[PDB]
């Protein structure tokens, strides 16, 4: 059965001074208007946890405070935690609910407020997320830093190639007014920015933000009959997942730890497509090593060569009068976690929303020509611990 | 499309174990693998539920990492799901889905907690914080269920003593299970005389805090037969269904459509192509008496609003049978349930499953139903009637 994303809604991004409940409720209202639906048309809701306001049975808490109950007929609610892979994991769960006929329509919601919560509270709760890892604080950046160092030793990845990631992302961010990064970085600025971990500087770190996104998923026929273009409500062609350890081993690490390749392969197989058929990529980029690993995993370049992929794109940007042409780097045209923003487990949602914009020819000055017919989105959780990949097609 | 079975069960003891949640989870999983005649490397997925005693970001991943499941040779899918006490059965349905879509041929489902060892102060704090914005007085969860019980008394004429009969019946079952935390059956007077917790809920009517963990291994029948290989000891998961309701009750009393167990039960029966008369064992979530009263109505063991009378007739028959509760006349929670077996937060719907397996395989001992049940229904509930999960297990 053909399943589509039929509604998208979201809040702004940044320091919003709103509760997580308020942000979630706003995003969902927006998504329902976008889908030409009302609350009573929803048959399920899936959410992911919040760091700023952790709640027991988060999805149920959101649904209750947002006034979805009482309901006429069946309503299935669930919370899932696969870290930043969560929004795409949930998307796959939504497809499953529709295909098994447990729910004809499904809301998927992610919301957080990790900028408004304050630096002290964020540091405490984000570091506590990695107890027993043995990682120095801040733990998540140090975890990714250890994998980056392994890459440099194993594959010859260069320090400057890591720093090129936020440069490229910032060039994309410039063409998105909502992106938190306003002015593109130079390579020198990134390398001169405050050190956070041995090979990770401040400008290479995911940008704390508040924000929420809601998606509505429905069977194609069901939607056509009741609620009444292809690219603006894309088909979810496939979703696949894979996993790895929550944190790295004390002693350096093996290639089979990385799970994105497995997820990507299975998503391509399920969709009956190859990398050459995909013309937009929304790839999780919490740190440069994540994006470098991602481009390899999805088949944009050979294993161990992701750093060189960045350098060629950087060099071409420099030779093109400092302009990063989207057609030569069809990745994260919104700016990613680096430069658009990162509300904890939310931002894989922005890969989906940017893919939809590209597919529907509504991406503006970021728009790819010709219009992409197919897109791939990738969510990552933990420290390369969860991989979720989906392929979206217009028709 | 494809037949999926529970091929391995493992669990720890129950009570005050003074072990970490990680340690309990790892032990349960090792036990389940031995029970399935499998090794770690034969697992292709792991689903877990959160712990109150040791909350962890990406709980399932944390457990899998500390337990040494990585590095792995092939694909391995890990996820944590939260539907409260409905979680173990929710996860069971997700495991079936992973097998049928061919994402994973084998799936471990794990629940672990240590809410007795964590201490009363910490438990009260974290359990009450679980219901922020509810407006419920402390302890919040008991008061939430208490409000629904009071509504039942006003709406359907449920009597106070009929609530108190639930733990009496459960304690009679618990007596015949050596692992159950309750070892001496209660009298009705003892329950009614016990310390008040909420307006119509006393201490002996409350879910019994405990530590414990359970692990299940789920696999396609053919896959399992080829590589690792009775029907009742490794039962078919015939169907799983879910439904939901608000996390906490409205300020002003409440409507019948709030309750979701009936919907979940109906859909599970439809998926399995069975009726209530085909089921001869019921493992029904019973965190408080009102939960069990609602459950027996929802699954079709008695009419709506009459669950209290169902308890009273069983109680009266027990009294007229020399104080002996005959399992064949009350084929429900033969282990003692959350009331009298024990309740490690989101774990105890696992014990409905393990008791169903024991009954189906004729390994339930002095609790054993005769004739041997061929089919069982298990029910998990989360929040305050907020999540319903129902599964039907059959031997063949
Ligand atoms: C969840 C999953 O499963 C997977 C994942 O997403 S992994 C990624 C999760 N997210 C993170 O790890 C967050 C990374 N960031 C951090 O840990 C911290 O922000 C940090 C260690 C980098 C800095 O912490 P800090 O010392 O408290 O500085 P912080 O208060 O954050 O920011 C200070 C300033 O730098 C700026 N800044 C911070 N990060 C920036 C970035 N990436 N780019 C540009 N500017 C930045 C801010 O604008 C801020 O300005 P003001 O002082 O004027 O407000
Ligand atoms: C999570 C979901 O999604 C759905 C659900 O499961 S909802 C149910 C979740 N679980 C609960 O709500 C737990 C219910 N229990 C409680 O809230 C509390 O234990 C309580 C309010 C009943 C009592 O708290 P308290 O005043 O601190 O007493 P507590 O420390 O628990 O124990 C009191 C004593 O009586 C005994 N006792 C406690 N509960 C008992 C019970 N249900 N039956 C028999 N004996 C009990 C204990 O052995 C203890 O003995 P000592 O103090 O002499 O060692």
Determined by X-ray
Phi, psi of A314 (to 5 degrees): -60, -50
Q: At which residue do the structure tokens 């419920």 appear?
A: B136
What lies within 8 Å, CB to CB, of A96 at 6+ separation is B97, B101
Q: What share of chain A is helix, strand, coil (3-state, %, to 5)?
A: 40, 20, 40
User: Which parts of B are annotated binding residues for malonyl-CoA?
Assistant: 85, 195, 206-209, 285, 383
Q: Which two tokens stand for residue A76?
A: 């299935």
For residue B330, what are the contacts with CB-CB under 8 A and spacing of at least 6? B169, B314
The count of other CB atoms within 10 Å of the CB of residue A226 is: 13
Kindly determine whether residue A64 and residue B131, on different chains, have CB atoms separated by under 8 Å: no
Cβ(A162)–Cβ(A148) under 8 Å? Answer: yes
Given CB atoms, is A70 within the 8 Å cutoff of chain B?
Answer: yes
Length of chain B: 396
Tell me how far apart the alpha carbons of residues A381 and B252 are, in angstroms, rounded to a whole number.
41
Instruction: Please tell me the residue having the least CA distance from ligand 2 atom 29.
Output: B120
Partner residues linked to A208 by β-bridges: A342
All residues at 6 or more sequence positions from A51 whose CB lies less than 8 Å from its CB, including other chains: A112, A114, A117, A122, A125, A126, A129, A344, A345
DSSP A287-315: SHHHHHHHHHHTTSS-TT-HHHHHHHHHH
DSSP labels, A9-65:
EE---B-----HHHHHHHHHHHHHHHHT--GGG--EEEE---SSS--TTHHHHHHHH
End-to-end CA distance of chain B: 15
For B264, other C-beta atoms within 10 Å of its C-beta total 28
Do A59 and A46 touch, CB atoms closer than 8 A?
yes
Are the beta carbons of B177 and B336 closer than 8 angstroms?
yes
What one-character DSSP code corresponds to residue B325? Answer: -
CB A148, CB A157: distance < 8 Å = yes
Q: Cβ B70–A96 below 8 Å, yes or no? A: no
B244 touches chain A (CB under 8 A): yes
Q: Which residues contact A166 (CB under 8 A, 6 or more apart)?
A: A185, A190, A203, A204, A288, A338, A339
Question: Does A253 lie at the interface with B, CB-CB under 8 angstroms?
Answer: no
Interface touch B80/A82, C-beta < 8 Å: yes
The three-class DSSP label of residue B303 is coil
Q: Where are the alpha helices (DSSP H) in B203-325?
A: 221-227, 261-272, 289-298, 307-320
Taking contacts as CB-CB distances below 8 angstroms, the residues of chain B near A19 are: none
- Give yes or no for a contact between B393 and B6, defined as CB atoms under 8 angstroms apart: yes
Q: What's the CA gap between B132 and B145, in Å, rounded?
A: 15
Nearest Cα to Cα of residue B341 among B318, B362, B358, B324: B358
Q: Who's near B173: CB < 8 A, 6+ residues apart?
A: B180, B325, B327, B333, B334, B335, B336, B337, B340, B367
Question: ∠ CA A126-B66-B93 to the nearest 5 degrees?
Answer: 90
- The answer to whether residues A333 and A354 touch, using CB atoms and an 8 Å cutoff, is yes
Among the partner residues A49, A247, A254, nearest to B65 by beta-carbon distance:
A247
Quick one: which atom of ligand 2 is closest to the CA of B386? 3
Q: What is the number of other CB atoms lying within 10 angstroms of the CB of residue B47? A: 28
Residues 6+ apart with CB under 8 A from B372: B232, B359, B360, B362
Nearest to A8 by CA among A362, A269, A245: A362
Cβ neighbours of A269 in B, within 8 Å: none
Q: How far apart are CA B354 and CA A56, in angstroms?
A: 26
Contacts of A188 (CB under 8 A, 6+ apart): none
Classified as helix, coil or strand, B392 is strand
Q: Is the CB of A91 under 6 A from ligand 1?
A: no
Contact A327, A293 (CB under 8 A): no
Backbone Cα Rg of chain A? 20
Chain A residue numbers touching B386 (CB-CB < 8 A): 57, 60, 64, 77
Q: Which two tokens stand for residue A191?
A: 């390398």
Domain that includes residue B352, residue range: 1-396
Looking from the CA of residue B287, the nearest atom of ligand 2 is: 8
- Residues 74..93 of B with a Cβ closer than 8 Å to A: which? 75-84, 90
A202 in ligand 1 pocket by Cβ < 6 Å? Answer: yes
Listed in sequence order, the residues at least 6 apart from A10 whose beta carbon sits closer than 8 Å to its beta carbon are: A27, A30, A211, A212, A213, A214, A349, A353
Q: Is B73 on the interface with A (CB under 8 A)?
A: yes
Q: What is the dihedral of CA A51, A53, A54, A55, to 10 degrees?
A: -150
* Tokens matching residue B149: 């019980």
Quote the tokens at residue A234.
């894309």
Task: Report the C-alpha gap between A157 and A292 in whole angstroms.
Answer: 10
Binding site membership of B92 for ligand 2 (Cβ less than 6 Å)? no
The sign of the CA dihedral A247, A252, A255, A256 is negative
Tally of structural domains, chain A: 1
CA distances from B12 to A337, B28, B45, B211, B339 (A): 42, 6, 21, 9, 19
A190 C-alpha vs ligand 1 centroid, how far in Å? Answer: 14
| Cα torsion through B111, A89, B45, B85, rounded to 10 | 20
Q: Return the bridge partners of B46, or none.
A: B78, B108
Three-point CA angle A252, A253, A259, nearest 5°: 155
Q: How far apart are the first and last CA of chain A?
A: 13
DSSP B185: P
Pair A52, A99: CB distance under 8 Å = no
Q: Does B359 touch chain A (CB under 8 A)?
A: no
CA–centroid distance, residue A378 to ligand 1 (Å): 22
CATH classification at residue A95: 3.40.47.10
Q: Using alpha carbons only, give the angle B94, B95, B99 rounded to the nearest 5 degrees.
A: 115
């Amino acid at each position: 059965q053909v399943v589509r994303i039929v509604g998208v809604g979201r809040t702004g991004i940044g320091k919003l001074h709103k509760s997580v409940d308020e942000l979630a409720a706003s995003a969902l209202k927006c998504a329902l208007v976008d889908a030409n639906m009302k609350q009573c048309d929803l048959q399920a809701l899936i959410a992911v946890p919040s760091l700023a306001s952790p709640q027991f049975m988060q999805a149920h808490h959101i649904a209750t405070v947002a006034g979805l109950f009482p309901t006429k007929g069946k309503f299935i609610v669930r919370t899932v935690d696969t870290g930043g892979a969560g929004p795409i994991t949930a998307l796959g769960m939504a497809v499953d609910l529709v295909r098994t006929r447990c729910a004809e329509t499904v809301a998927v919601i992610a919301a957080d407020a990790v900028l408004s919560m304050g630096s002290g509270a964020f540091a405490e709760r984000s570091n506590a997320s990695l107890r027993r890892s043995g990682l120095p604080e801040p733990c998540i950046p140090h975890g990714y830093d250890r994998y980056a160092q392994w890459y440099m030793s194993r594959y010859g990845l260069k320090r400057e190639q890591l720093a090129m990631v936020p440069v490229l992302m910032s060039k994309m961010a410039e063409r998105h007014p909502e992106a938190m990064c306003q002015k593109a970085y130079t390579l020198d600025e990134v390398l001169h920015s405050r050190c956070v971990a041995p090979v990770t500087n401040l400008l290479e770190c995911a940008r704390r933000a508040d924000g929420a996104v809601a998606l509505i998923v429905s069977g194609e026929a069901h939607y056509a009959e009741h609620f009444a273009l292809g690219g603006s409500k894309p088909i979810i062609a496939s979703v696949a997942e894979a996993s790895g350890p929550l944190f790295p081993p004390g002693s350096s690490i093996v290639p089979d730890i990385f799970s994105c390749r497995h997820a990507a392969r299975d998503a391509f197989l399920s969709a009956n497509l190859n990398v050459g058929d995909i013309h937009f990529f929304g790839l999780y980029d919490c740190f440069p090593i994540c994006l470098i690993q991602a481009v390899e995993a999805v088949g944009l370049c050979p294993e161990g060569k992701g750093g060189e992929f960045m350098e060629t794109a950087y060099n071409e940007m420099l030779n093109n009068g400092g302009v990063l042409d989207p057609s030569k780097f069809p990745i994260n045209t919104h700016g990613g976690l680096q430069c658009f923003g990162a509300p904890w487990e939310v931002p894989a949602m922005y890969n989906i929303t940017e893919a939809i914009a590209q597919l529907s020819e509504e991406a503006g000055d970021r728009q790819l020509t010709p219009v992409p017919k197919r897109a791939l989105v990738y969510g990552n959780g933990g420290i390369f611990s969860a991989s979720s990949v989906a392929i979206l097609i217009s028709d």
